[PDB]
Amino acid sequence: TTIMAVEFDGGVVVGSDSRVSAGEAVVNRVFDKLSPLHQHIYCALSGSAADAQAIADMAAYQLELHGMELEEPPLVLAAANVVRNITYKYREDLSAHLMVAGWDQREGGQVYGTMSGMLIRQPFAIGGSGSTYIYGYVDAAYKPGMSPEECRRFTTNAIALAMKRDGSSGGVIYLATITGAGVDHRVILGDELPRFYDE
């Protein structure tokens, strides 16, 4: 499991892998770890799928009332807290880990790591068991003020490095570009994955 999010001017790019693995065997080969909590808000699942899909649905519910009652799109800080309260309350029982990234009419693109019941805003965020290997790519290759075309190429290059080293990660990369106009959902097939040192 590898999830990633990058912040730029107009919005954020939320990347993820696909493969879901229980033990050393692969349960699901193609699985969508981006579950929208709201029109412009996306949550990247991580950790235990059974625990994350429960928190992602409870967070999509409590936030749905927040959307209707305010008659206005909720912020991303609102989405990150609904996820944090559920994660910290059950933290003994639920091993899930999420990542909340999206866009709003006020602050623009945002990315919040919810790990283990805490909350941070980050310019870029990586998560999942496959995160660790790409802590050298995202430190070096990252530069501030990147265009949306550069960010998608930065997120794609990064996860492609995680899937090769991680055994619990792999498959096709999902990319959701969230801007003020809408949400562009792409899919990067294995033939489009950027090639990197083979040996």
């Binding site: 649905d57 409870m58 519910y61 749905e64 009332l65 209707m68 009652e69 008659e71």
Partner: protein, 244 residues
Amino acid sequence: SRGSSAGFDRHITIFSPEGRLYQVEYAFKAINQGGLTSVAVRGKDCAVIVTQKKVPDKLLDSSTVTHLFKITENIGCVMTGMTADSRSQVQRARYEAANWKYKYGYEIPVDMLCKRIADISQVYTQNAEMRPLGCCMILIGIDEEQGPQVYKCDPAGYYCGFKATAAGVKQTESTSFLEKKVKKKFDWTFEQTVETAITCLSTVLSIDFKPSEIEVGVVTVENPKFRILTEAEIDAHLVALAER
């Protein structure tokens, strides 16, 4: 009997000698106390709500005063009745509409939202502890199967979908005009429906409404999301009343 009362029948809700329930009878009169009217017309591809909007004082903010609520993205609402009770059911309808999607995992249909609301107003009828609510909900919306849907919920718990509705002070007379146009069976388009719906109120009230005197919610097959027509969009349909 014919109106004979025995004991406490008229205070809490229990059967009288004639079998009626007087508390529910008086809930119907709590609708006429609102001092307004509302009409929701169902066209071929569209369902239009036209609400009489009263702002007697200039200090009153027009943006915050509306009878058109949003229950969920694709389902509109107009509340005719006690303003206090109106926002009571709307907050409850939104919970039932969101709870529907937390359990059943899809946006609630309009017909089944009027059923879970009318079934709750049945609890208040039997239990003698509390009174029924005095607001009459009218929901519109479009289901991907049956198309446009216009339903109504009385405080008694009896919900029925109508082709064209009315509520508030003027209803029977407002329906008498609706019997005239619906029987003729004109071709109903988005512009043809709103022009007839606004005329329906103008014929009863003898006004020729100004742009700021009404607010029009609309939903169409092309536009599934519930939208409120701005003062500019309203005046575009008001000039058509100069014509036919």
